[PDB]
Backbone:
């Protein structure tokens, strides 16, 4: 599986992966905040 | 890696260039020059020199007088309070005389006299600025395209401020001197006369303003994309066709099936820009004087929609 | 576009929201 | 408000402007037809007749005693191009037979411009080496660029910068002179040159960075720098030579490497 | 090879997708793969516009209006006669505009030019997508989009603007209007200057760029130059489009109410009140 | 990166970091499931 | 008749023909879907 | 017939065909989702 | 391709994949018809 | 058959395939969230 | 790539990853069907 | 693992990390101020 | 720890830090002025 | 401490400091004037 | 940096600063949890 | 700066000024907490 590092540059791949992970995490957290069931800030 | 011709990487500095000699009798340029490094990133870093003839002096003096009148009326409206001045600046306004005065030139100063004086001085300044652009073009042997383009905007300005109020015999139809007040005038003007969307000349002026935005976007993008072949040196491409002109023509011919020349594109741009204000002034002049309800006029000409064509209640409800 | 039908959305807006 | 019947003043004005705008569109098309017209057949090169709405030819009074231009009299390009159609159809592209960069096909094509240099308003050569300019210098806080290494499209160091050519009218850098490994001096357009180590954000960033200060030209490879068109006279470049150099560098974005002409897929 | 100089430029290559499959011309038009996609999407959109019009109350081109579904329908795919036609036409328009951008990119590559034109048009494409895709999605209903009618989308503009009191008080709207007006003034100035340079008066010769610099320094004391004017015009037009999209996208999603009341923030600044 | 040996080191580092990331995410998801399950 | 191929190349002709056929077929199917009589999906 | 590959390249044709198939399948699935008879998600 | 043999081999592969694709689609359509017919 | 990789770059193909898979997965998840039957966050 | 060995390696890796992806998706879809079927 | 610093310049990495941390912290503090449960300035 | 200054220029870092500190301090003071609880000027 | 004057130009630091301090004093005096408690001119 | 020894200096400095930052954040989050928990 | 000695002197000055700044801010925050606590 290490052969994947012979095709894709490690730096650009890591930067793109982290950007995508940040966008996904923020989207999921905002979606959870929007719901009344999973909102952790409005009520005790 | 790839230069995109957006910012100048390396700037060239030297002694200020004072300009080509005039071909007519000119007094002499005022040699006040400067250099701005950040303007050189986009364009040219040189500031100045300037020319101040009779026309420039008249324009500057009368415009200073008009601006001083408006500002002093703002200060009086604020009760001379700098804090009230800052708080209410957007709402400060020098308003035209009320309808009881008609189009009389004799109004008390606080009831509209200062408004008339400021309008007179501003009109003198604008007309002398137009004369100055004409004489500056004449002094260099150049064409009069910029004077006519400015004349179109002046036509709209004069229709808004003097010609239409004169034809209606009502100073109260004029535009007040204020940030929010002239927006309020715009909205009220649309409201009293039906709906200015249905003025066909307002629609034409919108067509030309939109098209000028489109034309500048396309032309600037094409020229910057042609920087590899000297596209921005348009004068030489017009008088000696290079590969930049050929590529610029072929791009748009392959995109939309037709193209202009390096000269013809500037004619297109000039005409769109001029027609914006020309149609705008024509449409404003006929509003109230000729047509009082533009929605009724659209109904008579079979282009006014009803609710069975489209119902905007849902769009209003969404925006609440 | 959502996974619902327009009729279902309209019925939910009318009955479940605008009628109760 | 009605003139006669249902005709009114606003309607009359609108119809007048509509007719005027149709006439203006026809006039603008006539102006746009001054270059490259009449049209010709794709294969035989047979010239089309010409528009019924065309007027007279336009003559430009050139400065510096260079005469008249008359863009309608510009000689038509030779019908025989150094290429062969990919398939026999009127719309097929031409595949160059030899070197497109040397022969001038596609992005590497050039126009037959004037064989004399552009001049300033007083008659001096417009584009000159910065030493021959009238007290024109590089901005002190801007890169000096003299002696900097030059990187090619294949990441090879083709050579260094030996001179700077500036426009005496517009006060702008137009060409960089590059001395290659073989010692040949070639002109490279400043519009294909990326300057590194002079980022505004990096200057704003509170860092101590020894970024390599060099010039990158990704249009053409290091070997291709040995085939840049040369100047007939030192210190002077004509419009034709400017077009030659700019076309040679611009065509590299397609022809420097074969992969540049291939789809992403 | 219609233009007298066109033949040498008509070469293969420069396509992003398709390679030699659609690398050809039809008359003046270059096709490519994205030209095929543009043709299909645009022709389908036009045909569906007229198919929905034939089902409507009139065929008058002024009064034809393809309307979005009702707000109560939410973001669901509606029946064609009840707003589904509008949704399919919106998808077709999005595909056509994106394919137009990509075809412009391919043509730019074929002529050895950068991607300034595709990006500039993509700004307007983003404005349209904001108007009829992003804003309805954020607002929760397709009924917030403007209708596909020559005069009914003006009614949509009027009613949406008046739903916020006076839309003149949107500050992003102010910025976009300023950019539009400055662009039109700049276009007038640039066209006039170029034309006056190449069309001299008094029997004089064609001018040099020094004459344009001198004219604008004698006029207003500053000249931006030949490259700077095109840079500034592109900046102004693109900013006008982008800030129009921003101003519409925030009204009804981020800001709800009267835009006039927003400016009550200025009166509460403790420096002057 | 060029040689397989250094590529193997890159792979080992990436896999270790990925394992740590996935383990933390699994612990967080297990805690969330114990708190408020989304199936049932 | 075969001489039409003396004036139109097969590649561009086929591409244009299939673009037009796709547009026409989608248009007709959508028009049929929009009518109650020929909508084959909404009712049993 | 096989001779169709003498005028069209398989590599590009496969990409174009799969793009078209993707768009067609998405359109058909969305059309099915819009009908109460065939919608498989809104109700049980 | 360029020679008849290569073109015929390309056609064989393409037609095999096409037959598989059409067979899968036919099975799905038969299932949908048995579930909810759209004719009659 | 590995013949495919002789005519298609593995890196470009992988990038395009993963972009398409991401868009499809996000679309399906959002569609499932939009329906009350399959929404897994609003209700217990 | 260029040599048949590298093409074989690439195809084997792609096929293995694809099979793993499809198996995970199959398990997820089976769990969803056992939870909330969409046919009936 | 220190080897990551071979593939990333820690100067620009630190600058970007600090900018991102600042944006995240300001966002979280503003969100907490928005809620009535965690607002710490309005009431005692 | 001192080696930090081998990477970041002290003059630019100090200027940026002081600008950010001024912005933050003014923001906090204005936020406190906004609140009724911590307003120190309107009432006695 | 005096070594600061080796990293910052006094001829610019003094100008910037004086301009900023003048703006700050103007702002504070205006804020005090805007309050009824600290307005020293409106009443005797 | 570039050498395995000096890059380790960079790593240890980064890890020390990160540990201090995380410890401060952990103390703040623990105080907030004792004050107003967001779970339960 | 460039040599370790100048960097150490710069760090000494920066740390001293930062400590003074933090001490002043701590006194101000303590006075504010004594006046009006923000954690009830
Ligand atoms: C009630 C109706 C039934 C149903 C009835 C049928 C019938 C009948 C058929 C299918 C067929 C298919 N169904 Mg089904 N199908 C249903 C619901 C689904 C759902 C879902 C979320 O519920 C999914 C994911 C699918 C998926 C599929 C595909 C595997 C297949 C599509 C044809 C194809 O291969 O060409 C598409 C070609 C491609 C190349 C697709 C490539 C996709 C790539 C990876 C995505 C990139 C595109 C884009 C960038 C990403 C998404 C963007 C937006 C969504 C537009 N169905 C429901 C439950 N389905 C067909 C089949 O079996 O043919 C083989 C078929 O005949
Ligand atoms: C509720 C608002 C109404 C509306 C009411 C009006 C009214 C009223 C008018 C317009 C006008 C216009 N409207 Mg409208 N308009 C509406 C909605 C729109 C929408 C939209 C929703 O998208 C658009 C694109 C437009 C677009 C336009 C423009 C096309 C046009 C003015 C352009 C122009 O030339 O600049 C403005 C340029 C000038 C004013 C020329 C100025 C030149 C002078 C010489 C400058 C002097 C400056 C001076 C020296 C500086 C110092 C001054 C001192 C400080 C005092 N309107 C709706 C229906 N609109 C105008 C028009 O002409 O249309 C028929 C007009 O009068
Ligand atoms: C009562 C009306 C309200 C008002 C309410 C609104 C509302 C609501 C909106 C605006 C918006 C705008 N208003 Mg307003 N506005 C008012 C008064 C004004 C006045 C004035 C003088 O009074 C002016 C100048 C303006 C000007 C403006 C602009 C800032 C903006 C429109 C430009 C734009 O969006 O470009 C962007 C360009 C596009 C969106 C077009 C994209 C083009 C596409 C991609 C290509 C189309 C291809 C086509 C199909 C090809 C076919 C051609 C051939 C057939 C082949 N408004 C009054 C107060 N206004 C709009 C905006 O800012 O949002 C975007 C907005 O939504
Ligand atoms: C900087 C932002 C501005 C801008 C940029 C600009 N416009 C551009 C470009 C640029 C740089 C191009 O390169 C491009 C071009 O190639 O022009 C020749 C274009 C263009 N600008 C256009 C239009 C346009 N631009 C607009 C706006 C703007 N353009 C901005 C203000 C407007 C407005 C304000 O509405 C118009 C109408 C076209 C002339 C052209 C885009 C050509 C194109 O998209 O090709 C697709 C082919 C078709 C046949 C169109 C698609 C057909 C549809 C599927 C059916 C119709 C659907 C539509 C939604 C119906 C609704 C209409 C109702 C509202 C009446
Ligand atoms: C200086 O350089 C420059 C020039 O010349 C040198 C310019 O010409 C230009 C261009 C500018 C002009 C010529 C001025 C006029 C332009 C204006 C007013 C703005 C644009 C507005 C317009 C209304 C013009 C028309 C716009 C259009 C989009 C029309 C498009 C029409 C068609 C039919 C496109 C068809 C093409 C396709 C769908 C793609 C290819 C596909 C096919 C052929 C289909 C094939 C299949 C079948 C079945 C036939 C610029 C900007 C420039 O900078
Ligand atoms: C850029 C956006 C790309 C979107 C995908 C797309 O644009 O799909 C393309 C067209 O879709 C279309 O316009 C129609 C799209 C309709 C959307 C609703 C598919 O074209 P091809 O399969 O190559 O050829 C179709 C054949 O009939 C040959 O002519
Ligand atoms: C309308 O829309 C809704 C409502 C959703 C309904 C419709 C839905 C529709 C139509 C959906 C259609 C979907 C569809 C239609 O084909 C999907 C196809 C999916 C496919 C083919 C997925 C394939 C995945 C393959 C994967 C993930 C492979 C990964 C391989 C990898 C990462 C291999 C890497 C490698 C390895 C390890 C070793 C190296 O030596 C060599 C190398 C190779 C680098
Ligand atoms: C619709 O949207 C919602 C609602 C959110 C629902 C849907 C959600 C969906 C569909 C989500 C799908 C998500 C998804 C679908 O695959 C996610 C996949 C995530 C993956 C695969 C994450 C992987 C992370 C890996 C990480 C962080 C690895 C980091 C490695 C690092 C920094 C290594 C550095 C290194 C080190 C140490 C040493 C050096 O020597 C070498 C080097 C390497 C420099
Ligand atoms: C939402 O928002 C609300 C409602 C407000 C809630 C949220 C609020 C949030 C998130 C706030 C976050 C804040 C934050 C997050 O790090 C602050 C950090 C502050 C820091 C590091 C301050 C540091 C200050 C250091 C100073 C002032 C140092 C000065 C040194 C000097 C001047 C030295 C000079 C020198 C000398 C003497 C001698 C020479 O020989 C050598 C030389 C060297 C020249
Ligand atoms: C939707 O949004 C809401 C509602 C908020 C919910 C979601 C929130 C989400 C998703 C948040 C995600 C956050 C996140 C996700 O990773 C955060 C990660 C933070 C991390 C890794 C922080 C790390 C900090 C490290 C620091 C500060 C290190 C500093 C080191 C320094 C400054 C070292 C300097 C150095 C020193 C001393 C010595 C020199 O010799 C060498 C040198 C090195 C120069
Ligand atoms: C700092 O304080 C001082 C005082 C020093 C400076 C203050 C400066 C300030 C704060 C100035 C602010 C000015 C502002 C905000 C102005 C805004 C103006 C706006 C937005 C105006 C918009 C439109 C105006 C128009 C269209 C006006 C047109 C007027 C015309 C054409 C008038 C013509 C009048 C004529 C011809 C005079 C006729 C005279 C007569 C009839 C007697 O004889 C012929
Ligand atoms: C520049 C391309 C060739 C233009 C020839 C015009 C006449 C033939 C057009 C053929 C179009 C495709 C085949 C017919 C449908
Ligand atoms: C090749 C790139 C084509 C797209 C460039 C960006 C378009 C505008 C996005 C806002
Ligand atoms: Fe121009």
Residues:
């Amino acid at each position: 599986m290490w052969r994947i590092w012979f095709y894709f540059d490690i730096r650009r791949a890591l930067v793109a992966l982290h950007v995508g992970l940040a966008v996904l995490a923020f989207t999921i957290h905002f979606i959870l905040l929007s719901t009344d069931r999973y909102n952790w800030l409005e009520r005790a | 890696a790839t230069y995109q011709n957006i910012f100048t990487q390396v700037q060239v500095t030297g002694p200020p260039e004072m300009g080509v000699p005039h071909l007519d009798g000119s007094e002499g340029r005022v040699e006040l020059t400067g250099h701005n490094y950040w303007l050189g990133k986009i364009g040219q870093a040189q500031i100045g020199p300037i020319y101040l003839g009779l026309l420039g002096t008249i324009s500057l003096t009368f415009g200073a007088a008009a601006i001083m009148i408006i500002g002093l009326n703002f200060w009086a409206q604020a009760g001379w309070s700098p804090q009230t001045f800052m708080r209410e600046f957007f709402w400060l306004s020098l308003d035209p005389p009320g309808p009881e005065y008609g189009f009389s030139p004799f109004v008390p100063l606080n009831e509209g006299g200062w408004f008339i004086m400021a309008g007179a001085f501003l009109t003198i300044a604008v007309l002398t600025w137009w004369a100055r652009t004409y004489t500056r073009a004449k002094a260099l042997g150049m064409g009069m395209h910029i004077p006519w383009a400015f004349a179109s905007a002046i036509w709209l300005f004069l229709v808004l401020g003097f010609i239409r109020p004169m034809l209606l015999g009502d100073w109260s139809e004029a535009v007040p001197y204020g940030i929010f007040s002239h927006l309020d005038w715009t909205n009220n003007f649309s409201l009293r006369y039906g709906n200015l969307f249905y003025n066909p000349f307002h629609a034409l002026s919108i067509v030309f303003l939109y098209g000028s935005a489109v034309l500048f976007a396309m032309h600037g993008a094409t020229i910057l994309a042609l920087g590899r072949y000297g596209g921005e040196r348009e004068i030489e491409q017009i008088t000696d066709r290079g590969t930049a002109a050929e590529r610029g023509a072929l791009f748009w011919r392959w995109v939309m099936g037709f193209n202009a020349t390096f000269e013809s594109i500037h004619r297109w741009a000039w005409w769109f820009a001029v027609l914006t204000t020309l149609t705008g002034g024509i449409g404003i002049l006929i509003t109230g004087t000729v047509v009082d309800n533009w929605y009724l006029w659209a109904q008579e000409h079979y282009y006014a929609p009803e609710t069975f064509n489209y119902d905007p209640s849902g769009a209003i409800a969404g925006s609440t | 576009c959502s996974g619902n039908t327009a009729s279902g959305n309209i019925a939910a807006e009318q009955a479940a929201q605008e009628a109760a | 408000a009605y003139i006669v019947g249902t005709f009114d003043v606003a309607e009359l004005a609108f119809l007048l402007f509509f007719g005027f705008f149709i006439a203006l569109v026809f006039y603008l098309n006539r102006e746009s037809r001054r270059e490259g017209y009449p049209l010709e057949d794709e294969q035989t090169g047979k010239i089309h007749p010409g528009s019924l709405f065309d007027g007279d030819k336009k003559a430009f009074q050139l400065p510096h005693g260079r005469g008249t231009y008359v863009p309608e009299n510009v000689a038509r390009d030779d019908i025989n191009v150094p290429g062969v159609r990919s398939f026999r159809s009127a719309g097929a592209p031409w595949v160059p037979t030899g070197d497109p960069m040397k022969d001038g096909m596609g992005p590497a094509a050039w126009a037959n411009r004037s064989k004399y240099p552009d001049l300033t308003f007083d008659g001096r050569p417009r584009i000159v080496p910065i030493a021959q300019s009238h007290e024109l210098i590089i901005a002190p806080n801007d890169p000096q660029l003299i002696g900097w290494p030059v990187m090619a499209a294949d990441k090879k160091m083709v050579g260094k910068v030996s001179d700077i050519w500036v426009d005496q009218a517009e006060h702008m850098i137009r060409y960089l002179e590059v001395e290659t490994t073989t010692g040949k001096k070639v002109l490279a357009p400043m519009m294909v040159a990326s300057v590194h180590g002079n980022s505004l954000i990096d200057a704003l960033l509170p860092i101590v960075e020894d970024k390599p200060k060099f010039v990158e030209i990704d249009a053409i490879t290091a070997a291709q720098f040995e085939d840049v068109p040369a100047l007939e006279t030192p210190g002077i470049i004509t419009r034709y030579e400017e077009d030659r150099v700019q076309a040679y560098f611009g065509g590299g974005y397609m022809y420097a490497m074969p992969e540049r002409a291939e789809p992403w897929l | 090879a219609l233009l007298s100089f066109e033949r040498k430029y008509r070469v293969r290559g420069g396509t992003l997708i398709g390679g030699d499959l659609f690398d050809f011309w039809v008359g003046p038009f270059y096709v490519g793969f994205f030209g095929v996609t543009t043709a299909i999407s645009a022709l389908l959109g036009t045909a569906l516009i007229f198919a929905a019009a034939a089902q409507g109350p009139t065929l008058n081109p002024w009064l034809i209006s393809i309307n979005p579904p009702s707000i109560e329908a939410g973001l669901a795919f509606a029946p064609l006669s009840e707003g589904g036609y509008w949704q399919v036409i919106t998808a077709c328009a999005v595909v056509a505009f994106s394919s137009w951008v990509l075809r412009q990119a391919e043509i730019s590559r074929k002529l050895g030019m950068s991607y300034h034109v595709p990006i500039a048009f993509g700004v307007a494409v983003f404005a349209y997508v904001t108007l009829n895709v992003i804003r309805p999605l954020w607002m929760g209903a397709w009924g917030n989009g403007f209708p596909y009618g020559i005069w009914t989308h003006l009614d949509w503009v009027s009613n949406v603007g008046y739903a916020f009191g006076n839309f003149h008080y949107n500050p992003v709207h102010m910025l976009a209007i300023t950019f539009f007006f400055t662009n039109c003034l700049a276009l007038a100035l640039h066209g006039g200057l170029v034309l006056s340079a190449v069309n001299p008066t008094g029997g004089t010769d064609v001018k040099t760029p020094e004459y344009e610099d001198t004219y604008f320094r004698d006029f207003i004391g500053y000249s931006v130059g030949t490259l700077g004017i095109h840079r500034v015009g592109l900046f102004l037009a693109l900013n006008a489009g982008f800030w129009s999209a921003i101003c519409i996208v925030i009204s009804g999603t981020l800001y709800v109410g009267s835009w006039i009341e927003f400016w009550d923030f200025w009166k509460k600044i403790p420096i002057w009140s | 990166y060029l040689t397989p040996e250094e590529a193997q080191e890159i792979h080992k580092g990436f896999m270790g970091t990925f394992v740590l990331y996935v383990a933390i995410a699994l612990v967080a998801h297990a805690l969330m499931w114990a708190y408020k399950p989304w199936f049932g």
Observations:
- The helical segments of chain F are 4-35.
- The first helix of chain F runs from residue 4 to 35.
- Chains F and H do not touch (no CB pair under 8 Å).
